[PDB]
Write a protein that binds this ligand. Structure first.
Ligand SMILES: O=C(O)C1=C[C@H](O)[C@H](O)[C@H](O[C@H]2[C@H](O)[C@H](O)[C@H](O[C@H]3[C@H](O)[C@H](O)[C@H](O)O[C@@H]3C(=O)O)O[C@@H]2C(=O)O)O1
Ligand SMILES: [Ca+2]
Length: 489
């Protein structure tokens, strides 16, 4: 083909483990199409049965028989760290000489290129570049509001009242107290509930991210506002307003809790969450989620903390052991070209989409399925966190008119907080970040889970928490980031 990057079929070994559940699959329809178009085939050497993607990365890197390519989600920091240590090769020259689509992309998106570079100036991975503006929003069961003769909640006091009514007043009508007012497929969203009491939970679409407040680098989970917000979240969990299994239900929470007519309220992405309106029309009579503006928080503001990232901390890299770096960067380049963006965004021609008027258009069966289109695509190897350039037109096609009115409402309302994009640390500053931040984050999450589940009291353990943050190096990390901030700005 005209899109081939090599004349002889080339097989590369990839270690890709993502979202704690999935691996590259050469027998994916999209992987087969990838091979057809590029003449490069990726063979997985990852453990399909393993259940923690970050631990699989760590194991593989420690094991001495490195693959040719490493890919996955939440690997930016490790791509940079181990790139500098020489396990991943710098891509700057390879891109300049052999990857015209990536080169053009970075030229038009210099902020993205700057955001993925290591302190030594090297590019150690090609990223997942999202396309879009908003990410999550709030959704509530309008049919339950109607049955209970309640209005959509305008503020946090009204939200509490409405969730309490969902809990206590049997809106699914079975005479059982089985309603679970707040559910979420991302456990981390339980902490984002602190927004309703004027506390940040994150500076970005990455959970538990740093943020900038009045020229100061802060971590949201270290602030007293977070302490006070978490007291409210713990009380909601105690009262059963939050899914008891919020920390373990995970990916199919909507299918289980909306499909089972148990859930009343969530914070999740506009396109896929609103698909459940048509998806459940048959099996759950009357089901209707509506987007609502964030209920006014305790400080008088409507917050949407989440936003679409300019670039995600995901993608793939070329290892030092890869004997075909030129073919590999050309293969990478395919996913920033139109033919490669088609399959990585839309799937396989004649299976999920067709070219019509020169553009990829999803088939009717795809657009009508109760399964959200991005889930359909995951199952065949598209919309996966390789290095690729996402195309928002894929998403437009299954964004319902009602979902779009929600998006436009959030844009017009200016609810969406601008995200933290990072600071430009030196090698020595980032080394402190590398030393401490993962340990701190793990400690934070464990404490937060205990607070939510009520096994630790927030007020009674806050001093210990702060002592721990200090001896685990959080404030050293903040110091380093503040230094980088002060130079930058
Ligand atoms: O659901 C949508 O409407 C939607 C539209 C966009 O086109 C993307 O497909 C978007 O994908 C999201 C997805 O909804 C999840 O939020 C996912 O979260 C994963 C995180 O990216 C990290 O990988 C985390 O460690 O795991 C999360 C997970 O496993 O769910 O992120 C994708 C994405 O950003 O592409 O959804
Ligand atoms: Ca009930």
């Amino acid at each position: 083909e005209a899109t081939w990057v090599t004349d002889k079929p080339l097989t590369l070994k990839i270690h890709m483990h993502f979202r704690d559940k999935w691996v590259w699959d050469e027998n994916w329809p999209v992987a087969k199409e990838s091979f057809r178009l590029t003449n490069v085939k990726l063979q997985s050497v990852a453990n399909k049965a393993a259940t923690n993607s970050q631990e699989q990365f760590n194991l593989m890197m420690a094991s001495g028989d490195l693959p040719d390519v490493v890919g996955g989600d939440n690997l930016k920091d490790k791509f940079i760290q181990y790139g500098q240590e020489g396990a991943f090769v710098p891509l700057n020259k390879l891109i300049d000489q052999y990857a015209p689509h990536i080169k053009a992309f970075f030229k038009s998106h210099p902020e993205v290129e700057r955001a993925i570079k290591a302190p030594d100036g090297n590019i150690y991975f090609i990223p997942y570049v999202p396309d879009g503006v908003v990410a999550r929003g709030y959704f509530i069961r309008e049919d339950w509001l109607k049955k209970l003769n309640l209005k959509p909640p305008q503020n946090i006091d009204e939200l509490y009242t409405v969730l309490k009514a969902f809990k206590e007043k049997d809106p699914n009508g079975n005479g059982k107290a089985d309603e679970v007012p707040f559910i979420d497929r991302h456990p981390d969203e339980v902490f984002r509930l602190v927004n309703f009491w004027g506390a940040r939970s994150s500076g970005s679409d990455n959970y538990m991210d740093f943020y900038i407040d009045n020229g100061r680098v802060k971590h949201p989970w270290a602030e007293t506002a977070f302490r006070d917000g978490m007291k409210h979240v713990a009380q909601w969990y105690k009262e059963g307003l939050i899914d008891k299994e919020i920390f373990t239900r995970k990916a199919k929470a909507r299918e289980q809790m909306f499909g089972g007519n148990l859930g009343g309220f969530t914070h999740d992405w506009f396109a896929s969450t609103m698909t459940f309106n048509e998806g459940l029309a048959k099996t759950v009579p009357g089901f209707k989620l509506i987007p609502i503006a964030p209920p006014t928080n305790s400080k008088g503001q409507r917050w949407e903390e989440d936003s679409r990232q300019k670039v995600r901390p995901d993608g793939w890299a070329i290892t030092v052991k890869n004997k075909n770096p030129v073919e590999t960067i050309k293969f990478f380049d395919f996913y920033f070209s139109r033919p490669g963006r088609d399959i990585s965004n839309f799937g396989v021609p004649g299976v999920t989409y067709d070219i019509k008027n020169g553009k990829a258009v999803f088939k009717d069966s795809v657009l009508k399925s109760p399964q959200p289109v991005n889930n359909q695509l995951y199952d065949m190897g598209a919309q996966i966190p390789i290095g690729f350039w996402q195309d928002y037109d894929y998403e437009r096609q299954w964004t319902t008119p009602e979902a779009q009115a929600g998006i436009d409402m959030y844009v017009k309302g200016k609810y969406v907080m601008p995200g933290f994009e990072g600071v430009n640390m030196t090698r020595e500053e980032r080394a402190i970040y590398d030393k401490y931040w993962a340990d701190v984050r793990t400690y934070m999450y464990e404490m937060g889970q205990a607070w939510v589940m009520g096994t630790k009291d927030v007020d009674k353990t806050w001093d210990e928490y702060q002592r721990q943050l200090k001896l685990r190096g959080l404030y050293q990390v903040l110091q380093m980031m503040q230094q980088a901030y002060d130079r930058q700005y």
